[PDB]
């Protein structure tokens, strides 16, 4: 399988097409809806990135290297580092607003309300 961090990409979901421009020129593709856990295929389909196709088959070409071992390896480096580029939607945003701490601060608002009945004639 293609090694990634958590979804880990089960190989068989990669389209590596070898062409000439030598068989070393690979035009690698990757499917955007490959079982990726809900929000993952959400951030991999849509992108404000480069090398991103509108059909979710991301376009990368393996040139500049004559050795076929390296072309396969360099394309992998431009996938995991690329997947980090798409998992970084504003570095840390979901952004998850807690729902129970909100009732705590609202209680504190009423706590100040109870003490705001001071001084007056």
């Amino acid at each position: 399988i293609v090694i990634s961090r958590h979804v880990a990409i089960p190989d068989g979901e990669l389209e590596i097409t070898a062409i000439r421009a030598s068989t070393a020129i690979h035009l690698r593709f990757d499917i955007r809806a490959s079982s990726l856990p809900e929000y993952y295929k959400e951030r991999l389909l849509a992108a404000s990135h480069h090398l991103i196709s509108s059909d979710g088959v991301i376009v990368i070409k393996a040139q500049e290297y004559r050795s076929q071992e390296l072309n396969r390896e360099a394309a992998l480096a431009r996938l995991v580092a690329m997947i980090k580029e798409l998992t970084t939607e504003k570095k840390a945003r979901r952004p998850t607003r807690p729902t129970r701490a909100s009732k705590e601060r609202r209680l504190a608002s009423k706590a100040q309300k109870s003490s705001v009945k001071a001084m007056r004639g």
Partner: protein, 123 residues
């Protein structure tokens, strides 16, 4: 007390620190405003107030609060900045002038329009 020491070393004077470090005595400054985003105020209150970072002509890069019900601010949009903090947002000490050069007035404002720079409808 010791007035003898007073003639050796005089009475001091505190540092007149200003709450608005925009520039020395400049009522307003021109900013090229970058990063128009939003944030949450501090603990006792809650909202998603619109804010924006800015860069003055002198070189300072501070934040500015965009008041009003809606805004026309975009990525660059050169604006004008005045003093005054909001107390709810931790880290902002500048109000943006609603109505100046690149900032339009708030939509449909009848009461209090000088502030928010809305033109009086003669029609």
């Amino acid at each position: 007390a010791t007035v003898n020491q007073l003639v050796r070393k005089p009475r001091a004077r505190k540092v007149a620190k200003s709450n608005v470090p925009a520039l020395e005595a400049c009522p307003q400054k021109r900013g090229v405003c970058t990063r128009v985003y939003t944030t949450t105020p501090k603990k006792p209150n809650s909202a998603l107030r619109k804010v924006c970072r800015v860069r003055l002509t002198n070189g300072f890069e501070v934040t500015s609060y965009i008041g009003g019900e809606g805004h026309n601010l975009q990525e660059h949009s050169v604006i004008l900045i005045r003093g005054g903090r909001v107390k709810d947002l931790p880290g902002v000490r500048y109000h943006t002038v609603r109505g100046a050069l690149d900032c339009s007035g708030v939509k449909d404002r009848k009461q209090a329009r000088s502030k928010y720079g809305v033109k009086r409808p003669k029609a």
